[PDB]
Design a protein around this motif. Structure first.
Motif, short mmCIF file in Angstrom:
data_model
loop_
_atom_site.label_atom_id
_atom_site.label_comp_id
_atom_site.label_asym_id
_atom_site.label_seq_id
_atom_site.Cartn_x
_atom_site.Cartn_y
_atom_site.Cartn_z
N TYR A 683 -2.88 -31.63 -63.97
CA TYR A 683 -2.69 -31.29 -62.57
C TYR A 683 -3.19 -29.88 -62.28
N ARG A 760 -9.27 -36.81 -59.45
CA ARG A 760 -8.50 -35.98 -58.53
C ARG A 760 -9.22 -34.68 -58.20
N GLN A 798 -1.27 -32.88 -54.33
CA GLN A 798 -1.75 -33.60 -55.50
C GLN A 798 -0.62 -33.96 -56.45
N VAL A 865 -5.42 -36.41 -51.06
CA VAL A 865 -4.40 -36.97 -51.95
C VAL A 865 -4.20 -38.46 -51.68
#
Ligand code: BEF
Ligand SMILES: [Mg+2]
Length: 880
Positions: A683, A760, A798, A865
């Motif tokens: 992340y 992502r 996110q 997202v």
């Protein structure tokens, strides 16, 4: 030393020193070349290297270059922040290994000085440090041994070589010469340093001082003090190199593309503007590509680890230790005091008439015949139980009254009813102990001994009354039971009340015949009541278990069969068998070693080193002193609660409740911690990549770079630092236990996570680029602000798509993780502080920034997202 292979008086000639006296000139001369009898740690601990060794990390080099360039660019603030966080990340890692140092003071406390020595022909006493080979030292029961050596006069002395062999019982010492090459545990003709002479007197020559002695060998293995890189540190540096290479690739790329724009430009172009533009882009990428909060976040996701372990009485001094236990695939344990609790207990008994499979409840319950042995066994022992209840005396003898107290029978109610005043002599020969017994008006002389010798002078047998002697079915059944108990490696003892003398003034050595033996008992140091499950649990978790012990092979092979470590038909090897085995075939044997026996300290560190070379990351659990080498050499060390301070200070983890279950429960936590950091780092790094994709696009289209310094910095070390930790706080998957041990060679993002990171991270940057385009249409100042809004909001949101790379936020507990939602709201606030009129200009947000522009940029981050969440379900991949 090979002295045990040598003869008695033959040793003094090679020492060229007389056994009778050592002159003062001998002390002078021998101290000049052999030195004192002392050990001092050879540790510079300058801490200059440690401050510099943080620059050996590629993650820090790039930031130093970036901050230095930031300084000359008039960007003082956003450079001092980098210097701040670099010192933070340095201070973490320096003191992370300062405390990871073997306490040679703890081993120094066992020096045991002031030993009686014959100097100049006069019996004198000096410190241990002033002792040198060739000198004559005196040993009396109760003092420790200053240094190792060979005894030329045995006054039936028994010593406790606990710190070498791992057994705490007294072993007899013989002056006789053993002309044979045997192990280190059975050096009967010579003593060693640090042991306590439990019994008897003696004199001895000392072959060596505190250096090149056995405790000195342990001290050398501890002085190496090199613990291998943790799986997290190994993986993280192997990826920190790959990460650092991207920066010196992209800086060259920027310095090249900005120069390329000068050729085709109308009237050329401004030269310093292109150069300085490349530099602004370069610092913008260097700060964004490194997650400078990664150390401050990994230390806190580890902040969760030993806190979850502290509720189970398992302390961890060194944080990086936790993750290590997750990747462990080989657990090597100590036999005495780790699998067991060192307590001697009875598991089965033998009486001529009554032999129930299980011992009965209370003396007022079984009531089978006259328990003559139960009454005399508490009289023949020499153990005491204090008001505290602590254990003192010979460990074999305490098993008589401990098992008695277990059966609702007090140790005093039977020792006070009968009064014994015996001669209580030594057991130099025949292992005999006589006593004076007064029952009713008759007399007796109870005597205990080994079943092989106590039956030699036996002349009576009796079941359900006195049966006097018998030849058949009596001398053959005792061998049957004693041999089957020795096949179970149970220390059997024979006790015979012997009413041979009556009302005599003192018991004589001649009148010890005509012995009438009551019963035999089989005592053994039994495993913990919680170890048997820790083995099935470890085998189903993918962990191979191995026992490394320094006790006899019989008990070491018996223990473990019941536990299930080795197969039903597997074989152990001695320490001698490891003294002659080289490294070539050991690695081919290392997969079928099963369980060891009678090993030396160097053998333990040897096995740990060999397993490391095999490619499996291992763990060591032991309690005495003889485990500290293996502990410091192993990736992590686990010390017992009752273990000596040497292992406690030389181990990374120290459990205090002796509950061995907590070991396997540790691995389950280990794999969890890593599994969170993996999804945390992901992340934190994906959001970094998205910041780069947005910068590079502004270079290939020649836009004002969407982000500035102090901006990206604030996003990395302050903004996302909360959601990364929040993801660290995620729950553990029930499938974690069955999964095979994670290999030490796979990458951090290996296992399908890498595809999630790139997905992502691409979506973040794509949305940010679009917002910069909109702002660019409005004004150049706007584009910067709208792009930053999109980045700081998309990295914040996110978290929902980054809670799990294999599942969506919905259906996996949207509100399950209180910390994730807390971080999303707190980062909404940490972004709201940007729009404040006082801090609006310190973030490069223009004065014309309105709510409509925010609507656009925030819609983009939201939709980014959204993209991530729909993407996660697209494929059957990501499953390992
Ligand atoms: F006490 Be252990 F078996 F070295
Ligand atoms: Mg032990």
């Amino acid at each position: 030393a090979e002295i045990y292979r040598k003869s008695a008086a033959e040793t003094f000639t090679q020492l060229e020193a007389t056994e009778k006296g050592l002159t003062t000139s001998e002390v002078t001369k021998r101290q000049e070349k052999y030195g004192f009898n002392e050990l001092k740690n050879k540790k510079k601990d300058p801490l200059w290297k440690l401050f510099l060794e943080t620059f050996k990390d590629p993650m820090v080099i790039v930031l130093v270059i970036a901050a230095l360039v930031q300084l000359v660019l008039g960007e003082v603030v956003e450079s001092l922040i980098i210097f701040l966080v670099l010192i933070v990340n340095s201070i973490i890692s320096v003191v992370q290994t300062r405390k990871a140092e073997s306490s040679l003071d703890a081993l120094r406390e066992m020096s045991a000085p002031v030993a009686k020595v014959i100097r100049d022909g006069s019996k004198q006493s000096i410190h241990a440090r002033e002792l040198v080979p060739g000198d004559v030292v005196i040993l009396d029961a109760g003092d420790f041994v200053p240094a190792d050596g060979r005894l030329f006069e045995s006054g039936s002395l028994k010593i406790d070589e606990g710190m070498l062999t791992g057994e705490s019982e007294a072993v007899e010492k013989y002056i006789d010469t053993i002309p044979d090459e045997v192990g280190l545990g059975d050096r009967v003709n010579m003593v060693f340093s640090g042991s306590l002479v439990v019994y008897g007197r003696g004199m001895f020559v000392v072959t060596g001082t505190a250096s090149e002695t056995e405790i000195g060998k342990i001290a050398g293995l501890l002085e190496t003090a090199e613990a291998k890189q943790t799986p997290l540190q190994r993986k993280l540096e192997s990826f920190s190199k790959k990460l650092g290479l991207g920066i010196l690739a992209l800086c060259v790329l920027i310095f090249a593309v900005e120069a390329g724009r000068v050729l085709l430009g109308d009237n050329s172009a401004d030269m310093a503007t292109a150069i300085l533009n490349a530099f602004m882009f370069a610092v913008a990428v260097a700060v964004a590509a490194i997650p400078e909060a990664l150390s401050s976040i990994v230390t806190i996701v580890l902040a969760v680890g030993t806190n979850k372990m502290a509720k189970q009485h398992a302390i961890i001094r060194k944080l990086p230790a936790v993750e290590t236990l997750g990747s462990t695939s080989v657990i090597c344990t100590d036999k005495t005091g780790t699998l067991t609790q060192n307590k001697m207990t009875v598991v089965d008994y033998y009486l001529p008439d009554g032999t129930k499979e299980n011992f009965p409840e209370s003396p007022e319950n079984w009531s089978e015949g006259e328990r003559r042995l139960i009454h005399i066994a508490v009289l023949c022992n020499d153990s005491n139980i204090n008001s505290e209840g602590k254990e003192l005396g010979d460990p074999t003898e305490v098993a008589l009254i401990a098992f008695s107290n277990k059966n609702n029978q007090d140790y005093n109610e039977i020792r006070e009813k009968f009064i014994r005043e015996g001669e209580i002599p030594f057991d130099s020969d025949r292992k005999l102990m006589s006593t004076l017994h007064t029952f009713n008006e008759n007399k007796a002389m109870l005597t205990k001994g080994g079943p092989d010798v106590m039956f030699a002078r036996c002349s009576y047998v009796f079941l359900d009354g006195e049966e006097k002697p018998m030849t058949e079915e009596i001398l053959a059944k005792l061998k049957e039971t004693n041999e089957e108990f020795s096949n179970q490696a149970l220390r059997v003892l024979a006790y015979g009340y012997k009413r041979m003398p009556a009302d005599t003034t003192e018991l004589k050595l001649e009148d010890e015949q005509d012995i009438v033996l009551v019963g035999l008992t089989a005592m053994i140091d039994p495993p913990r009541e919680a170890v048997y499950a820790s083995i099935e649990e470890s085998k189903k978790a993918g962990i191979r278990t191995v026992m490394i012990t320094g006790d006899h092979k019989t008990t070491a092979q018996a223990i473990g069969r019941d536990i299930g470590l080795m197969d039903a038909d597997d074989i152990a090897l001695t320490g001698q068998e490891l003294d002659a085995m080289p490294e070539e075939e050991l690695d081919k044997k290392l997969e079928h070693i099963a369980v060891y026996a009678r090993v030396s300290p160097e053998n333990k560190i040897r096995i740990v080193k060999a397993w490391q070379k095999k490619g499996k990351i291992t763990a060591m659990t032991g309690d005495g002193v003889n485990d500290a080498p293996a502990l410091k050499q192993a990736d992590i060390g686990v010390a017992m609660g009752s273990g000596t301070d040497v292992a406690k200070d030389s181990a990374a983890m120290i459990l205090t409740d002796d509950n061995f279950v907590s070991i396997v429960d540790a691995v389950g936590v280990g794999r969890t911690v890593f599994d969170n950091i993996k999804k945390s780092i992901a992340y934190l790094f994906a959001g970094n990549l998205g910041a780069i994709i947005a910068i590079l696009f502004a270079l290939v289209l020649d836009w004002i770079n969407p982000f500035t310094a102090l901006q990206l910095l604030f996003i990395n070390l302050v903004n996302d630092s909360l959601p990364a930790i929040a993801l660290g706080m995620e729950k553990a998957e029930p499938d974690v236990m069955k999964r095979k041990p994670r290999d030490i060679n796979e990458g951090i993002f290996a296992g399908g996570t890498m595809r999630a990171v790139i997905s992502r991270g691409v979506l973040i940057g794509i949305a940010v680029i679009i917002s910069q385009y909109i702002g660019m249409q409005i004004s150049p100042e706007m584009s910067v602000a709208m792009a930053f809004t999109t980045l700081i909001l998309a990295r914040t949101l996110q978290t929902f798509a980054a809670r799990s790379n294999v599942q969506t936020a919905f259906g996996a507990g949207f509100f399950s993780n209180k910390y994730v939602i807390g971080a999303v709201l707190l980062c909404f606030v940490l972004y709201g502080i940007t729009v404040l009129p006082g801090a609006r200009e310190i973030f490069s947000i223009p004065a014309s920034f309105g709510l409509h522009e925010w609507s656009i940029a925030a819609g983009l981050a939201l939709a980014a997202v959204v993209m991530m969440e729909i993407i996660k379900v697209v494929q059957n991949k990501f499953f390992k």
